[PDB]
Amino acid sequence: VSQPPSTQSTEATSGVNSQEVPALTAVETGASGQAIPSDVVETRHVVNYKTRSESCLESF
Amino acid sequence: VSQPPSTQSTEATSGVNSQEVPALTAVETGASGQAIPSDVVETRHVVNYKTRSESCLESFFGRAACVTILSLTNSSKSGEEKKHFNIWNITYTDTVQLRRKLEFFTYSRFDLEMTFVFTENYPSTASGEVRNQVYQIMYIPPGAPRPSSWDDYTWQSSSNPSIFYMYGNAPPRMSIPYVGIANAYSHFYDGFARVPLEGENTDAGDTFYGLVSINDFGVLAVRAVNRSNPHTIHTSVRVYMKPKHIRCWCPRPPRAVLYRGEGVDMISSAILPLAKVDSITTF
Amino acid sequence: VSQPPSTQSTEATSGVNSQEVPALTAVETGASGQAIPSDVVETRHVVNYKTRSESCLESFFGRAACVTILSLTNSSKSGEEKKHFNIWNITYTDTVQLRRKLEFFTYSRFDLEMTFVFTENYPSTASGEVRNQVYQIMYIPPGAPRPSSWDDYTWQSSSNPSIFYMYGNAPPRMSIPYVGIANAYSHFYDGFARVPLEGENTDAGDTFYGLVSINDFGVLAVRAVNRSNPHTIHTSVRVYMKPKHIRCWCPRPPRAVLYRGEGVDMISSAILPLAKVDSITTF
Amino acid sequence: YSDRVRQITLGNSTITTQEAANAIVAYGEWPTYINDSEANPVDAPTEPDVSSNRFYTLESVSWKTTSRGWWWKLPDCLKDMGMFGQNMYYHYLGRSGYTIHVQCNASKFHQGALGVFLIPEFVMACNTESKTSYVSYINANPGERGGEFTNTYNPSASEGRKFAALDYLLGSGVLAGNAFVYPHQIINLRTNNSATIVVPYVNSLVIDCMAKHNNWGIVILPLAPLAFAATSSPQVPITVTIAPMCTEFNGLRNITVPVHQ
Amino acid sequence: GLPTMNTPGSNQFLTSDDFQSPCALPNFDVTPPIHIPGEVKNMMELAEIDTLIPMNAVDGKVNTMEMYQIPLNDNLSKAPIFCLSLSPASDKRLSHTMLGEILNYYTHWTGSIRFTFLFCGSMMATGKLLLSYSPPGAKPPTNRKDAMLGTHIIWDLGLQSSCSMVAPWISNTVYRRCARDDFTEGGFITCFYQTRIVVPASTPTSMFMLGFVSACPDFSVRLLRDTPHISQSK
Amino acid sequence: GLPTMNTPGSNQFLTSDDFQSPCALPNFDVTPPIHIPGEVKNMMELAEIDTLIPMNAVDGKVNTMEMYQIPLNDNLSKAPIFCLSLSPASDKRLSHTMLGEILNYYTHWTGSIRFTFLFCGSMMATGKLLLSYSPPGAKPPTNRKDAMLGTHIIWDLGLQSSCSMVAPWISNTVYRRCARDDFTEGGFITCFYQTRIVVPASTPTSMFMLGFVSACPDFSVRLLRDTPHISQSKLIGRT
Amino acid sequence: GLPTMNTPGSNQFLTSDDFQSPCALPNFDVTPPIHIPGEVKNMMELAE
Amino acid sequence: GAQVSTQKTGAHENQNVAANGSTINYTTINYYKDSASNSATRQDLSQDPSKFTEPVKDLMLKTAPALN
Amino acid sequence: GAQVSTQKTGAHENQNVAANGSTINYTTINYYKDSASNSATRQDLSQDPSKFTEPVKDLMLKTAPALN
Amino acid sequence: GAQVSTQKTGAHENQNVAANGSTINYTTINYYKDSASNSATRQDLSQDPSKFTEPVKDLMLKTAPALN
Ligand SMILES: CCCCCCCCCCCCCC(=O)O
Ligand SMILES: CCCCCCCCCCCCCC(=O)O
């Protein structure tokens, strides 16, 4: 008996003044963008207990 | 294995002439008086093995109440094809007894059991042989397409859950897990669905107030599944609900008067809930 | 292995010329004779493997008796609308065989199994096609609201337990836990519900003497749930009861004569329970 | 160190009462901030503690011998406050607990009593006989100026789109005598000059939009009639002062400006 | 196939049934719980809250706020201030208090009941009131002497305010029926002046007191029933 | 033999039933599996793929390829270039994207949504675009000053042609309805020029941007429902 | 789920039937017993 | 948690000792929450006939004269 | 994976002890994947009336003047 | 050969851990010879979005310039 895998949690963050910026990318590459809220704005720690069970193909 | 907790047992006591007497207190503060019989009179020891099982919220709300009565008609008349199809909003407000019990709490979380009971008759002045009827109960979550007719394409139920019942078998039943988008269902919503802004008239928001405009739990669509017969059949479907696995918060007084609609609106002809007594000194 | 204890075996004995004579006793003492065959006659040694099972109180009261016959009528005639439902006082006094067995004891404690049997016919001289009928059995405990009609709001049953039975399915059934107020049900009440106190009526108590005045177990409310049809359906409902897990106290003789009402009243026309014998010397 | 004397300091303001009933904490729970384990919004919250958690005095009302009662929507009455008020308009979401202090002084020769009740979700009936929940935003949310209770219900739609409330049924069909199930305290002019009730944020949600929903309302009723020996018309003020507690807000937008009149 | 035999009770619907049933929405993800203040686990937690008694139901005060106001006066009286039948479920004035409304969903009840009273008059006025409960089956306590024979306390008005009289659980039965049967009668509750309330100069002479009722924590209820208080159009 | 009782629900058919059933073909030999590239285990794996949104669904471009092209001028303008309602199933332009479509089979949803914008102008064209998201319960932004108060990112056009903004899950609720609703308001997404696009001589002065939409990793859906994007005529057998 | 077969004797009401049944009044607190003298366990004690 | 107990003997030469055979046992499983739902109780042949046939303050021996 | 728990006391089930042998127990097996499909949960008699009857910050005791 | 597993959480349930108590377990027994006759499979909840969202031969890190 164990907890099922959850969707992505949010790490708390702060403003970033580095030059390595994940919000700037290319799609020419065939890849999707990878940014999440913690990459763009200041975020809080959020514990995410939500589970993608309804969306499993067996459920669909 | 152990004995469940009982209500308070009275301990034997005796007369008291102390300076600390519970009978005299104050209720200016929000507390209730705390006195029990042993504080007022001499009492005997009483062993109390009685409990409060029936007043547990799980027991209080442990019955399946009727919620609504829907009606379908199986008819060959073209003017009645529309009657093979009946869509009801999901609600608990159609029947007053269940509503008052739920109205005791401001918020709640529960799973819901739904049971349906079917009954039928000929509404006509003449009857004759008709094949056994099958009924389909389909849930259409808000945002899902509604059928335009008893025999439309949405009844194929590719995603919408639905149940098929043959009249005469045991009344159909299913469990619905808690479905609120909130962490609890609200029984009250002291607010508006949207905020009318400066660039709006001053009557703005008049129809957006209350639980009524905020909640939408979809609809239940019920139809005859048989094709029409020469002898009309009227079907009455009773819908029952039983909250289970229930927790509640923030108690409220129950309503003393008759309800007008789904909100808390009062009836001007029925705001007099109490009986008269001939005098204050009449027992 | 809890081998059931048998009734006594008979010890073999010889005749004696002893001064100890168990056959000569007194009953003035308020006790039965104690003699058994081994005390009075020469006897054989008999091993006794027989037991008293059918006589255990649990077995004696182990069958479901018909208690009452209720009736319903489903008809389109307006004068019959009131006949769609039947309100029955909960009681066992409608049936004599059961009262007589229960009245062997002054007090009893038991759980109760209730079973119902439905039967139906057309009371008319002209039958026709009618849909399967469904019945609702609702328990309305003391002080709970009564329906004014077969289709009244009280049939919502949000707390009152109820059974929905489709005709032809297995006879409906349910258990009732002991619900007495006292620690046992009494079958007798030698008293009045209240003491008349200088009430200016020397006949006071005439309307509130006996067991009836102290018993209110609510009513059983039974209705057809179907709407009216062109062909009337008459339904008989039989209520059966089986006390279970039963203990009793303070035995008394059974009634020898016909009952007149719910109390112990006699009809003067039937106070002669014994047959005549031509002579005391007739075998 | 008498129980009747109480001092509460929040932010940069203080309330001192020489005579008060023991303060009440609704449901036994002190106001808190949202724990990470229950957070709904993802963005970093703002917690303007000193600026927000400052007692704000509301315009007082007069208690007359004919008064039936007064009421407020709680976060709404504070929308006219500088800080906190602006935060409700700048942030979509917010949470706030409150310290509610009600004062009404009188000499020993006065009688009467005010029950103060805090009603979670104080939903009220409309004054229209043909429509349900028919109340305009503006009439429903009067701001600092509170509403009043009446003796009789007279439905009718300029008066229709307004709340109306009987005092005896508390505006919703519930007898006032059971108002006591709600967190409450009583100001008895005889023994108690003031009441203090502290409430946690209460909702089905951890945080909500304060421009749309009022999670608490304040109900004050003259449970015992006001009276005085030689005027037959004593006029004693009632002052209500409230501070937010443990507040926080989420999201950020061009300031929202509601429909007003 | 495993041989089986359906017993009576098959294919029936009981509103009190407690059986398992298939989920209409398999694998549904239930919104996580949060802590919410004010959790209630048992209705008796609400029965124990002191709520106001609509003691005054005289013509002109029925269904008005004044129903909760019991008059007191400086003038001398030997009369009962008030009289109440102890029937929390069926009495006209008690059935609608919170204790009453919860209780009206039950068929039977036990335990003691607390009656709490508070004086809202001037600080300047003093006096003593007799709060009394007499068990049933005897002449109603229509005067002070009978009030003294029953269970009673004296409420001495001063700095403190509220005074609680407790009607102990005295019954022959284990439980009392909610319905007002003769054999259910709870007894009589009265209040009398023990001494005249004295009002000093330039102090109002008409005074009011409030009364409240609540369950003591030895209180319980039995079977659940539909409450007779609510109705609706068909 | 074994005493039993039939409970409510007996002999019913529920389309969401999960019960065992006898096999019509006992001992049938099922073809051994092979690995096939591209296995999907969850619908959310598709929800997270950037989809091109038909944002410019304006008359004359609706249902043409041009609906996917957001026009941009070098000429200075203070107007928004585009605006969307962040309501995945009710905004008609958004509701037909793969994200919208997966969501059209669900009643309720959660999580942040990413918006990615690709500039397809000349290499010689430069400038800056402002992308922003404002939460609900507010005046929709009408100009850049309002855009600046909401959550925003400034995208410097340059070697990297694409950037993104994330509309974070800012909601009072845990879930929002997919279904159009007044309470579960989406919020607003807009774009304004931060500065004019500067274009040199003999270089296109009118260029396009392509917007894409996808789920973030914290995204979830909850109640399967029929999707009102698909219809059919009445079905009658053996005609 | 579990394959079953109804045997003769099914769906019948025997007045001497001794099977379990659901309770209409669940979680009921039964008035506790007290000692009452004169308890009878078997009808034969009266026959004697 | 099944309860196993013996059966009442039937016709097939069941020695009355009821300890003869392992096939004269049966199994009961209670399924419902309220015990009121249980089948009838186990047989109890314990009896106290003296309560009714010879209650007495001064115990009498049957072989003694009843009155002395 | 069955669970066993005590039945509620009936007319002749025991003393209120609910400790009168194994015959007063019952067995439940969950047959569904979804917890919402389970029968009603175990009765919880935990209670804490003070949340509503004595929600006071200054924790005064009963045998005391309320006002000092 | 019964399988015992964990149920999906309901309203009056344990915390979001979903691994607290025995009351959340349920039992499944397969009755038929073919596995095709079994009830639906257990949720996998396993995913690999990179198959469709970033199936790139070359390695890119999130904060890395996509092109260099
Ligand atoms: C196939 C039939 C499925 C039936 C689905 C019923 C949905 C129940 C919604 C929740 C009940 C209303 C809650 C509330 O208003 O507070
Ligand atoms: C769903 C219908 C439930 C019917 C319950 C009826 C109440 C039966 C009470 C027990 C019988 C009275 C006691 C006695 O026989 O002396």
Q: Per-domain residue ranges for chain B?
A: 1-283
CA proximity to D60, closest of D75, D77, D83: D77
Ligand 2 centroid to C57 CA: how many Å?
20
| C230 phi/psi in degrees, rounded to 5 | -60, -20
Contacts of G32 in chain I (CB under 8 A): 15-16
Ligand 1 atom showing the smallest separation from residue B114 Cα: 4
Q: Which residues contact B115 (CB under 8 A, 6 or more apart)?
A: B64, B171, B172, B173, B239, B240, B241, B242, E13, F8
B42 contacts B70 by C-beta, under 8 angstroms = no
Could you give the dihedral angle defined by the CA atoms of residues C151, C154, C155 and C159, in that order, rounded to the nearest 10 degrees? 180
The CA distance from D135 to E109, in Å, is: 43
Mention every residue, 6+ apart, whose C-beta is less than 8 A from residue E183. C193, C194, C213, C214, E177
Cβ neighbours of residue E67 under 8 Å, at least 6 residues apart?
B274, D168, D177, E54, E55, E56, E57, E61
Any CB–CB contact under 8 A between D39 and chain A? yes
Distance from CA of A28 to the nearest CA of E (A): 37
**Count of H-run helices and E-run strands, chain J:** 1, 2
- Stated in angstroms to one decimal place, the resolution of this structure is 3.9
Task: Find chain D residues with C-beta within 8 A of A7's C-beta.
Answer: none
In angstroms, rounded to a whole number, what is the distance separating the alpha carbons of residues C216 and E181? Answer: 9
Question: B101-140: b or e for each residue (b if 16 or more CB lie within 10 Å)?
Answer: bbbbbbbbbbbbbbbbbbbbbbbeeebeebeebebbbbbb
Q: Is E178 left (phi over 0), alpha (psi -120 to 50) or beta?
A: alpha
Distance from Cα G32 to the centre of ligand 2, integer Å: 18
Spell out which residues of chain E touch residue I66, defining contact as CB-CB under 8 Å.
160-162
Rounded alpha-carbon distances, angstroms, from residue F123 to F120, F159, F163, F175: 9, 8, 16, 43
CB-based contact B73:B222 (threshold 8 Å): no
Task: Give the closest-approach CA distance of E38 to chain F in angstroms.
Answer: 20
The dihedral sign for the CA sequence C39, C42, C45, C51: negative
**Amino acid letter at E119?**
F
Please answer whether residues B190 and D141 qualify as being in contact, where contact means their C-beta atoms are separated by less than 8 angstroms.
no
Q: If contacts are CB pairs under 8 Å, which of residues 116-175 in chain B contact chain I?
A: 175
Rg over alpha carbons for chain D, rounded to the nearest Å, is: 19
Pocket test for ligand 1, best of B67, B112, B163 (most atoms within 8 A of CB): B112
Closest-CA distance, B236 to chain C, in angstroms, reads: 8
Give the binding-site residues of ligand 1, using a 6 Å CB cut-off. B 90, 92, 112, 114, 137, 139, 161-163, 176, 179, 185, 215, 217; E 24
Which numbered ligand comes closest to the C-alpha of B176? 1
**Strands C105-121 and C185-186: what pairing?**
antiparallel
- Asked if residue E178 lies in contact with residue E91, where contact means CB atoms within 8 angstroms, the answer is no
C142 lines ligand 2 (CB under 6 A): no
Rg of chain C over CA atoms, in angstroms?
A: 27
**Helix spans in chain E (H):** 44-47, 98-103, 144-149
Whether C138 and C155 have beta carbons less than 8 Å apart is answered as: yes
Q: In this complex, does chain C touch chain E, defined as having at least 3 beta-carbon pairs under 8 Å apart?
A: yes
Q: Which ligand is nearest to the CA of B177?
A: 1
DSSP E163: E
Chain G interface with H: residues with Cβ < 8 Å: 18-23, 25-28, 30, 37-42, 44-46, 48
* Nearest by Cα to E46 from E100, E86, E82: E100
Task: Confirm if G42 and H45 have CB atoms less than 8 A apart.
Answer: yes
- What residue owns the CA closest to ligand 2's atom 9? C217
With contacts defined as CB-CB under 8 Å, which chain F residues touch J26? none
Q: Please name the residues between 178 and 207 in chain C that touch chain E, using a CB distance below 8 Å.
A: 179, 181-183, 193-195, 197-198
C103, C264 Cβ separation under 8 angstroms: no
- Experimental method reported for this structure: cryo-EM
Residues in a beta bridge with C175:
C113, G23
What residues 199-258 of chain C have any CB closer than 8 A to a CB of chain E? 208, 213-214, 216, 218
How big is chain G, counted in residues? Answer: 48
Asked if the Cβ–Cβ distance from E30 to J43 is below 8 Å, we say: no
User: Tokens 């009878």 — which residue?
Assistant: G40
Handedness of CA E176, E182, E187, E192 (dihedral sign): positive
Q: Residue by residue, what is the 3-state secondary structure of chain F?
A: CEEECCCCCCCCEECCCCCCCCCCCCCCCCCCCCCCCCCCCECHHHHCCCEECCCCCCCCCCCCHHHHCEEEECCCCCCEEEEEECCCCCCCCCCCCHHHHHHCCECEEECCEEEEEEECCCCCCEEEEEEEEECCCCCCCCCHHHHCCCEEEEEECCCCCEEEEEECCCCCCCCEECCCCCCCCCCEEEEEEEEEEECCCCCCCEEEEEEEEEECCCCEECCECCCCCCCCCCCCCCC
Ligand 2 atom with minimal separation from the C218 CA: 7
Decide: E and B in contact? Rule: 3+ Cβ pairs under 8 Å.
Answer: yes
Question: How many angstroms separate the CA of residue C127 from the nearest CA in chain E?
Answer: 27
CB contact under 8 A, A50 and E26: no
Q: Quick check: E226 and C213 CB within 8 A?
A: no
I-chain CB neighbours of G28 within 8 Å are 8
D253 touches chain A (CB under 8 A): no
Q: Measured in angstroms, how far is the CA atom of residue E127 from the centroid of ligand 1?
A: 59
Query: Which residues on D lie below 8 Å from I66 (Cβ)?
Result: 3, 22
How far, in Å, is the centroid of ligand 2 from the Cα of C176? 7
> So where are chain H's domains?
1-68
Q: How far is the CA of C89 from the centre of ligand 2 (A)?
A: 10
Among C19, C235, C5, C27, smallest CA distance to C132 is for C235
E84 and B CB contact within 8 Å: yes
What residues in I contact C178, CB-CB < 8 Å?
10-11
- Dist CA D210 CA B221 (whole Å): 36
Measure Cα distances from F115 to A13, F48, F128, F168 in Å: 21, 11, 17, 11
CB C127 within 8 A of CB C234: no
Q: Which of C115, C220, C223 has most ligand 2 atoms within 8 Å of its beta carbon, as the pocket-test mutant? A: C220
Backbone dihedral angles phi then psi of residue D77, each to the nearest 5 degrees? -65, -25
Distance B56 CA to ligand 1 centre (A): 23
DSSP state of C122: -
- Nearest CA to CA, how far is C133 from chain E (Å)? 13
Alpha carbon of B175: minimum distance to chain I alpha carbons (Å): 6
Which of B67, B87, B90 should be mutated for ligand 1, with most atoms under 8 A from CB?
B90
Name the residue of chain F whose CA is nearest to B143's CA: F179
When computed from its CA atoms, the radius of gyration of chain I, rounded to whole angstroms, is 21
Q: Map out the domains of chain D with their CATH numbers.
A: 6-250 (2.60.120.20)
Ligand nearest to the CA of C181: 2
**Do residues D101 and D8 make contact, with C-beta atoms less than 8 angstroms apart?**
yes
Which residues in chain B have Cβ-Cβ distances shorter than 8 Å to J13?
A: 245
Q: Is C247 within 8 Å of chain H by CB?
A: no
CB contact under 8 A, G19 and H53: no
Distance B217 CA to ligand 1 centre (A): 6
- Tell me G26's DSSP state: T
User: How is residue E15 annotated by DSSP?
Assistant: T
Tokens of residue G22, six digits? 């659901």
Q: For ligand 2, atom 5, which residue shows the shortest CA distance?
A: C139
Using the Cβ of B79 and the Cβ atoms of chain E, whether some distance falls under 8 Å is answered with: no
Nearest to F134 by CA among D252, D57, B87: D252
Closest residue by Cα to atom 9, ligand 1, is B217
